[PDB]
Amino acid sequence: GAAVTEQELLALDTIRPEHVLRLNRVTENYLCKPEDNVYSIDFTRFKIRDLETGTVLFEIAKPVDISVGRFVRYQFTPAFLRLRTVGATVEFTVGDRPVTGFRMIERHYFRERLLKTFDFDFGFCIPSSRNTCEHIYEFPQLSEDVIRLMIENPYETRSDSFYFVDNKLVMHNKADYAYNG
Amino acid sequence: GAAVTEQELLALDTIRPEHVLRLNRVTENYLCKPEDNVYSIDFTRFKIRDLETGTVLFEIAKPVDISVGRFVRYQFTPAFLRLRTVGATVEFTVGDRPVTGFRMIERHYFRERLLKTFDFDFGFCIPSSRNTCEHIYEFPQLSEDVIRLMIENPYETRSDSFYFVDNKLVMHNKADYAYNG
Ligand SMILES: CC(=O)N[C@@H](CSC/C=C(\C)CC/C=C(\C)CC/C=C(\C)CCC=C(C)C)C(=O)O
Ligand SMILES: CC(=O)N[C@@H](CSC/C=C(\C)CC/C=C(\C)CC/C=C(\C)CCC=C(C)C)C(=O)O
């Protein structure tokens, strides 16, 4: 199907996975509100491994309770862009409502250029508890020119992560990235 | 001056402190982009004290470099709403550009009701280093009805924090709050 705009999706009754898969630019604004996370999904830890070498690259964890939402800025080193197969172990809590079809679509762009879409299922989740999921990211094979542009233009690589439960958008996190660490 | 809308501010060449002081609702969307933080301000730690008792209430710190931006969700206990004078010690780094007039305007709302505006100056900042500032929040004297509504309706209390450097908006962080911890 043809490309859709951020403004078109905001006018819909419900945003479905198939709809965000036709966005052709990273969004400017968010496509849902914090209060749409009616399942209280809260990411608490992720551990990132290079699956070719088995090396743990890094682990990020949450340090009155706070939930960081909506936006993360990452600065990586240039070798990050040379990875091929990266495993993410993602820990998260969920609230008291049962979750079905928890699905994540991530779209990564350098400026206006889509680099890669990832579309993962989270699997079965126990309510009111910590849950864990492993995702395997097969990185795009980036050209040398694109790699150079991404290193030279920090934070112009950006992503949208759209999280669905039962085919309805419930969370939308954004990020930008540099590779000049 | 009369109230301004989020859409009116987005149409301006530059958003000034006086402009956000006339918003009469928490914003739906952000009034600047991540890339507008051309000073690379990154909050790294804050320590919150009840200044009446001297008690440290809590400290939040950041755990490849990441910067959490744009949105934090807080869950406090109901006693938080009874505080009167709260000291925040805020640690942050700044990039290589010199900073002048670093100013923060925070507006806190329960639903559509403005509870309090805070307007603080950060003082002088050394580029390319960690900086610290102390702010003193004089909490509004909330009615018992408002306190009850805020406890009973988690995450319907929301804030905008608008950060200015040299009278131009450079960061806009948002939060929502519960008081039923
Ligand atoms: C509030 C917020 O935003 N929470 C974030 C982080 S918590 C959930 C963590 C997840 C889903 C793991 C994210 C995976 C990684 C960081 C590994 C690095 C791989 C990439 C950045 C893709 C690389 C793509 C290209 C090179 C084109 C989020 O929702 O993700
Ligand atoms: C990305 C992001 O969002 N970073 C956040 C947190 S880093 C800077 C920390 C600051 C400015 C300290 C914030 C102060 C507190 C948390 C103390 C609690 C006081 C209140 C919540 C006001 C209470 C108001 C009423 C009861 C009406 C931000 O920019 O703030």
Q: Could you give all domains of chain B from N- to C-terminal order, each with its CATH number?
A: 6-178 (2.70.50.40)
Q: Which two tokens stand for residue B181?
A: 């911890």
Contact B70 A174 (CB under 8 A): yes
Chain centroid, CA A31 distance in Å = 14
Q: Which two tokens stand for residue A57?
A: 């690259």
Is A74 annotated as contributing to ligand binding?
yes
Question: Hey, which of A106, A117, A121, A170 would you mutate to test ligand 1's pocket, going by the most ligand atoms within 8 Å of its Cβ?
Answer: A106
The rounded distance, in Å, linking the Cα atoms of B127 and B130 is 8
Could you tell me how many residues make up chain A?
A: 181
Q: Which two tokens stand for residue A18?
A: 């198939």
* Method used to determine the 3D structure: X-ray
Whose CA is closest to B142, among B105, B113, B174? B113
> Nearest by CB to B71, which of A69, A74, A155?
A69
Tell me which ligand sits closest to the C-alpha of residue A42: 1
Chain B residue nearest residue A27, CA to CA: B33
- 3-class SS of residue B47: strand
Closest ligand 1 atom to B68 CA: 1
| Ligand 2 pocket residue status of B127, Cβ below 6 Å | no
Give the contacts of B157 (CB within 8 A, at least 6 positions apart).
Answer: B108, B109, B110, B115, B150, B176, B177, B178, B179
* Dihedral angle computed from the Cα positions of residues A143, A149, A152 and A154, in that order, rounded to the nearest 10 degrees: -110
Q: Where do the DSSP E strands lie in B8-127?
A: 42-50, 55-61, 65-68, 71-75, 85-94, 103-110, 113-121
Residues of B in contact with A174 (CB under 8 A): 70
Q: Which two tokens stand for residue A23?
A: 């966005």
